[PDB]
Amino acid sequence: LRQEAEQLKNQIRDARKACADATLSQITNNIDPVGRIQMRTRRTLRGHLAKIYAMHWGTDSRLLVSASQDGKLIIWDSYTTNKVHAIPLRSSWVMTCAYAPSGNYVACGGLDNICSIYNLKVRVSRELAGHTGYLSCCRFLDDNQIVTSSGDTTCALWDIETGQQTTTFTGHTGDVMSLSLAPDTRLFVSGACDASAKLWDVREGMCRQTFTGHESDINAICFFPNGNAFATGSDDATCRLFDLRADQELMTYSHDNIICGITSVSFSKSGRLLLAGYDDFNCNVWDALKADRAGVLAGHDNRVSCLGVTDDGMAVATGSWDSFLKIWN
């Protein structure tokens, strides 16, 4: 029974150990440091009532979407600070939000177990339901497909018109809390309450790889722009960068001073900077190749809950529990 599983685990551990010739730090020790980075709050939105939970930049580098515990989903224009739209949610709690690349649809879902989707040309076009538990994160593959992460330890791939789960990516111990998409639509990964963070293929529907190798409670995942690597934030103080081709770890971003975990992780456009929000009121940035902190961002009144870097790389927007979204450049 479990003997085969133990043998397989030993085999994969041996393969990972054999494949690890020289660590990333060993190669990167001869690379110029990024140096100190000064980030200033260019514009503060401050148009929210309660603590906000998640945000998502639009395909254009301007528009925003933020969801708060007040139950109101407000679309924000970063350049002008004017509120383009304010779509109330039937559920008072919205655990996440998403902006479609088309821009004609916005999805927000929370503890209601329904991934409500709004049409911007603001009415609920279709509400997708079928998850046993709460939702954690939603992303748009296209204008007609959306992948949701549920508290039932399953991730699903929906179709808007059909309204049914096209594929269910079962096989996870803990509840998934965050997922990210590859630059292409073929692959996407997620990390659960269990330390395991697995890679999935939207076509096959099977977990191609499983990394884990973390303490507990992975809370945020982002893709390196190249798509060959992804970084996981966890309730442990450390933040790690994995690797799909090597199927193992590369570097661990930990500091003695920090004792809180991670809440959101997002790379820069070039991938050199790994911006990671913290349970502490201030966000931290890391040199993705040197594993050295570059500069602490300004703090909010409460803990941060989301990060987002523009598709053009213009600025990074962080929204905390203080109901304030502070665009940083």
Binding site: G47, L49, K51, Q69, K83, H85, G151, G174
Partner: protein, 231 residues
């Protein structure tokens, strides 16, 4: 041209006015949470209060919202409820003998320990309800399951003379109920931002709404007093 900017500013002004109205409507509404076991009888308390499931009731022109999260052993949605005035906790005081393949009451005590010593909700009080008081009285009077069989602390436990009991006409059920209350009280006191408010209630009783109203009022008063440093 500037016409688009003017239209966007007008839309922003309208949205801001609607947001201000919504803030005025919402800041006066108090949020409560139901966190009870499946066998704890939370349905009876919900029915009493009405007379994710959201229940809205108004007492003395004050609006309340009551949210029940509905296994979920690893409670990660608890951190979401940080703005609620109080957390309504329901535990069946008659479920001491019931055993889960650890007594159910001990499981409720562990759940209360987990809730109390939570980093995210450290300023959220707990309103405690103990349903099935009649069932507990019947179990104690019958003696089929000795109270000391599962709880060894009953050997040295004595009834508190300070606490005046209800006219239950039996010292034994009174001692058992007060021991069950004192377990939760000790667990809560082991940790002064938030307080625990035990209550002995029965399914027949319908005065729980006034109890919740008064307790929430006292919670807000204590929060304000500690904010101004008078307590």
């Amino acid at each position: 041209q500037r016409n688009e900017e003017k239209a966007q500013r007008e839309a922003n002004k309208k949205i801001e006015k609607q947001l201000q109205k919504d803030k005025q409507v919402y800041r006066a509404t108090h949020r409560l949470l139901l966190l009870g076991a499946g066998e704890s009888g939370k349905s009876t308390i919900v029915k009493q209060m009405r007379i994710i499931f959201e229940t809205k009731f108004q007492v003395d022109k004050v609006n309340f919202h009551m949210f029940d999260v509905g296994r979920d052993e690893r409670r990660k949605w608890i951190q979401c409820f940080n703005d609620v005035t109080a957390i309504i906790f329901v535990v069946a005081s008659s479920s001491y003998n019931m055993v889960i393949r650890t007594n159910r009451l001990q499981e409720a005590l562990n759940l209360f320990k987990s809730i109390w010593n939570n980093r995210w909700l450290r300023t959220i009080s707990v309103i405690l309800f103990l349903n099935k008081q009649d069932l507990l009285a019947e179990k104690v009077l019958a003696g089929k399951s000795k109270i000391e069989d599962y709880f060894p602390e009953f050997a040295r436990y004595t009834t508190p003379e300070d606490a005046t009991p209800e006219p239950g006409e039996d010292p034994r059920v009174t001692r058992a109920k007060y021991f069950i209350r004192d377990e939760f009280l000790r667990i809560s006191t082991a940790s002064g931002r938030h307080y625990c408010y035990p209550h002995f209630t029965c399914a027949v009783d319908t005065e729980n709404i006034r109890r919740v109203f008064n307790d929430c009022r006292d919670i807000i008063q204590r929060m304000h007093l500690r904010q101004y440093e008078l307590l």
